[PDB]
């Protein structure tokens, strides 16, 4: 019998997701790694318990997370049953379909066949009646967006998803999805782009403007650029020199490199949340302290950008 | 085996709820207090049985009623199983979501997540396939009403609620909710404001007009002003003085103070029902007698208001 | 094990119901009487089996048929399970709600509460997943027809009724229900009025114009005027009886019983989809279906029939 | 325990169905014959396993396939449970209602009663929660198309079919069905007409254009004209011209059947051809039609002349 920390909601910051009434914690837990069959369940159990004890109420999955595919959803489902039976209505659970999941022409893409069959598979693996958010995981240029939208719509109408999201859609395609969903009287809840210090496509492309204009939230995937924006590597000598200079700016702020990278994303109120792909419980404890310093000077932002340019860190 | 009073429908007055074809008893039972795990089930049983024997067919609940939260729904569900198994289709059962119910950001307010997870919890606690009326229990300024309305609409489309209501919404927000639900071809059935002799926000604000203009019914919550209108207290000296003068008017009518307060709400067609929160069976027998004198003269209505103004009883 | 007549579809006439693709037998069986707990089930069984062996595929019920109320549905459900388990998809089963069924304010009228609670009760009594036609049984002036229509629409969308009907609605109210159901993209299937030789409200009112203009079928209730148009009575006046005697003489000249002529008269053209026969024994069905052998009337005969009705004051 | 061929997706060609995102294999398996209660289940099993091993992921049924009616659905359902329990999400399974299925006024045609009762029967026989495509199997001139379309829409909204199709509808009635389903926000996925070298109503009539303009797929039923466009073989004149067509196939390095299938698949106007195989080896043979999908103008003219001259229509 496990009792979550009674003070779990006392320190975490929650942000409304776009124009919706749904509040996400400013850091959410992603299950892309660390939750497959290659990872001991004991380590997974410690990560989920620590996340919820820190107030992290959103756990982001996809059909193909593991490895092998599906196994993150299976393991999460087991841990939900063991440790979170009383707490499911305090959690926001997502999953997704769009990348390669199972073999053959219906195991990938944006088709109604793949999306609705995959959703049914994910619900069965996780042992849930519904997910809080179902995403289209990526753009399928070969399926008309009307088909994809109408599948997202069916998942909501049929009670298998409370809300729907998209991931890695351009501003123009985001706009079209919002309009198509509005035909079914469903607001697009949320967009999940890759977004961090080193990958600024969402600001350059004007995605953040499209999202605010349509009241859609934004949750940053790979906010730590897969370990580049942590202590980890402290590729080219110029890259590393600029990473060292960024780490010095973080130290000036009393922050770790990772904390500053997360604070940097959470400086825009147009970012709803940042997805932390934590591999041990201590990482969550350290990352959430980013919330202690969310302001940057003009000079700081200019210097950050200048170090990124110098080191050619825009990969 | 319990057999309800065969004459239960013979005396109660029923009112159509706004423009709808649903008839509510002019007095309904509210379960805000008295039905928690802190109250013995035998006392609850005797209240529910008496209410139905008097023709009271509408039982009003909300997710957080108890204490603790959820326990009034649980206890009601047990009693429905034990005593009302043959009668469920003779009852109108409501519940609601909006106030704090469970910890964290999804346990309060107007979101789709909270309303729909809460409704599922309530149906499970009560052992019901659906409720007859599902409410948004209060305004959430931080959820768009489009979202709250769509969640109510989903509850109806999916067969978990027959009708929908709102509680404590301004006239402007109530109008907007009527419009938003009409986009789903669902009429807003009912609004549950606080309304009694001493608190007439619904009238001054224009809400009663908004409800009639849209065919929405009105069920008065705290019609006895939480004891102020029962002579429980017979507060400033001028308050107390005006309460005693009100009680004298009641006595001139052959009524208790509680009975006059209820008759006053029921004096015309602007109120569908008044929600009585009984702690014992006898209170119900006494309150339903209000129906024997629903008439007030112009002079009586003026003198009531004068006493209230004089005592600053607003 | 009971095997229905292999030749059952060979002689019955079927009529498309209004503009729809649903074909009703020109004679249907109604369970208004003879199917209550006051009637032995062996008698009921003989009636249903005979009906179906004659090609009568439409069995018309209502929540309150018995007595007591609901017992016709229960008895029918038992016989369906015992004798018609392989034949349900060959049957058109209807039920209704609108008259007094259970005590109190939700047990009568047109409200969404009553209609939807009642349809659940009926499906449980009959042991069916759905009925083929669900009716509003009568007008409720105190429920808006938008509420009654929405209730019927919900029965269809939820899969508990394939089609919907109304009974005893005026032309103007019929037209409104058609428009209201069309907002849900549902056509009104059918109208069940009382209609027979002695009761021509449907003609005189304009109902038959409304039904044709909107493609709604018409199923005649009490086509034998509760025994007035049979052998039974040959309180009624001497003038009434004299005219009924002369009508029976007309029937005999056509080689028909009075009941057969009364049924042929309704079915003489395409304004009536079916006539509801309320048989109390198997033989009655055999006799009534033979009305189909003579559906033609001359202009002189029609005028003569009306004259005897006027002379005898039989309206 | 049966393990499908790991290389099954490596050679088959898949075509997007109309404007949709659903990819059908260029050859699909039809179960019109060979899957009845008159056919041993071991032979059916070998056929379905071979199909899937070749990458044929679409299996096309209808209520009344057998004989007796319903039996193809029942047998396919058994083989799905035995051999394809892990693979159902890789399959596209259709069924249909429209022709004579059961006795009486509700057992044929286009009515909501028939289509929805029939789909429930088909799901039960097959042991499926839903089919991937549900068809109206033929035109019913006595049911308003609004009724048929609404019943197809209900099958989709209720989760009993992912997509909807029609079969043997004129271009005018096709166009009407597309419009009616669009009122329900459902795209017509696919049309299944009879189409082969000897039967070109779909081209003559304007249908292929109607399908193209509305983004609807086209799957050819009886692509081998019921054995006429194979080795198998009614007049002396007919037989003469079938001999000559066979020579043209031999020039291309094809059997008559391979050429007849290549001819349908020669351009993008056909999504798939429905093969009704009676033994596994036929499928191995027919799939090689994909090796040669090109025809010169001279071949195309010569084919047509042999058919003209032989009376083959
Ligand atoms: Mg696994
Ligand atoms: Mg364990
Ligand atoms: Mg007990
Ligand atoms: Mg028996
Ligand atoms: Mg076997």
Residue numbers in the entry:
A (entry chain D): 2 to 235, 259 to 339
B (entry chain A): 2 to 235, 259 to 338
C (entry chain B): 2 to 235, 258 to 338
D (entry chain C): 2 to 234, 259 to 338
Could you pull the original sentences from the published paper?
In all, we determined 23 structures, four of them not deposited in the protein data bank. All the proteins are oligomeric (YghZ, pGI, BglA, GDH) and belong to three different fold families. YghZ and BglA have a classic TIM barrel structure, pGI adopts an alpha/beta fold, and GDH possesses a core Rossmann fold found in many nucleotide binding proteins. Based on these experiments, we demonstrate successful structural characterization of multiple proteins using only microgram quantities of purified material.
As in the larger family of aldo-keto reductases, YghZ, has a central TIM barrel domain and a smaller, mostly helical domain. YghZ is a distant homolog (<40% sequence identity) of mammalian aflatoxin dialdehyde reductases of the aldo-keto reductase AKR7 family and to potassium channel β-subunits in the AKR6 family, the structure of which was used for molecular replacement. Four amino acids (Tyr-66, His-138, Lys-97 and Asp-61) form a putative catalytic tetrad in the active site. Although some extra electron density was noted in the active site, the density was too diffuse to reliably model the dinucleotide cofactor or substrate/product molecules.
